């Protein structure tokens, strides 16, 4: 049976665009019904890496389960959660993606972070995350203290380092900065490692799934 996304794109649904919340739960589907120009997708502007592949890999799913890979209440004792954005508004108020967590400085420091997750389930886990690129050095420091930060994401079949690039992009949804989105499929028995000293849009909800 087809998966109805309504007014949302695959990106808006998978990342958790706040306006894509009433979407009804489904554990299985074949074919995703998406409008030609969905209104609700990447509310916070940025590049969604390997998107078309993701769209293809999610076209037919036999099992789908969302879980809190990194629970908000206990995973980030040393960091604060940003107030999100007006670009991602819900009910007249600023919000953010439901499946991601915008970590910010706690006090006068954005401490180094190392968070890992082992795929205890017997299914593949879709992990998504982002990397923020402020438009100005003032915003970089205001949020992360350090001017030069890094983000590292490593598994047994994935390893990438992300360096924020501070600059004004053309305005999109009133935002000159950007959040680049990334993803990987964590096979059973593998471990993913998140390391950063700033600019990480951390995973909050991941998806254990069986493709096809």
């Amino acid at each position: 049976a087809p998966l109805q996304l309504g007014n949302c794109s695959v990106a808006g649904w998978i990342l958790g665009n706040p306006e894509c919340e009433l979407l009804i739960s489904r554990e299985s589907w074949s074919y995703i019904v998406e409008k030609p120009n969905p209104e609700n997708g990447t509310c916070y502007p940025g590049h969604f890496a390997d998107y078309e592949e993701l769209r293809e890999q999610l076209s037919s799913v036999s099992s789908f389960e969302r879980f809190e890979i990194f629970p908000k209440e206990s995973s980030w004792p040393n960091h604060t959660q940003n107030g999100g954005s007006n670009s991602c508004s819900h009910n007249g108020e600023s919000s953010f993606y439901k499946n991601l967590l915008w970590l910010t400085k706690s006090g006068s420091l954005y401490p180094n972070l190392s968070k890992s997750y082992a795929n205890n389930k017997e299914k593949e886990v879709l992990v998504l995350w982002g990397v923020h690129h402020p438009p100005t050095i003032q915003e970089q420091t205001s949020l992360y203290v350090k001017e030069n930060a890094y983000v590292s994401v490593v598994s047994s079949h994935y390893s990438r380092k992300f360096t924020p690039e501070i600059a004004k992009r053309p305005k999109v949804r009133d935002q000159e900065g950007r959040i680049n989105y990334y993803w990987t499929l964590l096979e059973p028995g593998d471990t993913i490692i998140f390391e950063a000293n700033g600019n990480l849009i951390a995973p909050r909800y991941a998806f254990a799934l069986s493709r096809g």
């Epitope: 502007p45 590049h47 969604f48 690039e165 600059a167 004004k168 992009r169 053309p170 999109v172 950007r178």
Partner: antibody
Framework: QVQLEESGPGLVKPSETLSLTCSVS??????????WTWIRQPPGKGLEWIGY???????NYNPSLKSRVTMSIDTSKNEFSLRLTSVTAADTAVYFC??????????????????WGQGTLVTVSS | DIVMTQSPSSLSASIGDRVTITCRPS??????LNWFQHKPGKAPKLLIY???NLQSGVPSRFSGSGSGTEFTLTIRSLQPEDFATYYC?????????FGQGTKVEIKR
């Protein structure tokens, strides 16, 4: 914030090589996020894209002019340049230099110049 | 190779009028379309980015709409300083290509 200024207007003899430079102020031309571009407008015609250059070595020129175009970056002077060989009257135009910010979710690579210079007129004559 | 066709090529309207300019590419470009404004002797200015995003400092009377093969630039309340030539530009395929331009004149 950023300012771009093309080199002075003037003449180029036919079959010779046009050389233009763009002086950049406010940002470094070595920056990885920014691309540097040239565009032209012949008299009474519209706009024609010539190409872009990244400090990282990434370049792309319009197939209409690829063989004749060479672009470069000068980090010492914070400038970039355009060279066009074998010029003809068809190359008589106002040349604009410009900057763009790489933004792959909303633009092809190096394809959205959003800060332009005012342009310099090049006349091909003997 | 992607041909950008603008309509009309020139128009004249009174102060306060609503002005619409159409741009049609030769193929579907999704939302990879930008609108430029070019005044005599001045640097061309990016007004609308990716079909609909207003740029910093541009008055809110300018707006962009459309996707695929039909795009529209709207000036809701034409002002004298809006005299210029307006270009659409596609960013979907290389080489980037511009429309032939639309000259907007002021009726007074």
């Amino acid at each position: 914030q950023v300012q771009l200024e093309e080199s002075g207007p003037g003449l180029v003899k036919p079959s010779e090589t046009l050389s233009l430079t763009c002086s950049v102020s406010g940002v470094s031309v070595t920056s990885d996020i920014y691309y540097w571009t040239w565009i032209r407008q012949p008299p009474g015609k519209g706009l024609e894209w010539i190409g872009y250059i990244f400090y990282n070595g990434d370049t792309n020129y319009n197939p209409s002019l690829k063989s004749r175009v060479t672009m470069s970056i000068d980090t010492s002077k914070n400038e970039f340049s355009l060279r066009l060989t074998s010029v003809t009257a068809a190359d008589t135009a106002v040349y604009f230099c410009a900057r763009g910010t790489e933004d792959l979710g909303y633009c092809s690579s190096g394809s959205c110049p959003n800060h332009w210079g005012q342009g310099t007129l090049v006349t091909v004559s003997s | 190779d992607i041909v950008m066709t603008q309509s009309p090529s020139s128009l004249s309207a009174s102060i306060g009028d609503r002005v619409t300019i159409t741009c049609r590419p030769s193929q579907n470009i999704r939302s990879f379309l930008n609108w430029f404004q070019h005044k005599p002797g001045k640097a061309p200015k990016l007004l609308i980015y990716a079909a609909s995003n207003l740029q910093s400092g541009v008055p809110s009377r300018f707006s962009g709409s459309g996707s695929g093969t039909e795009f529209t630039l709207t000036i809701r309340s034409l002002q004298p300083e809006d005299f210029a030539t307006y270009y659409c530009q596609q960013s979907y395929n290389t080489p980037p290509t511009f429309g032939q331009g639309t000259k907007v004149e002021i009726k007074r």
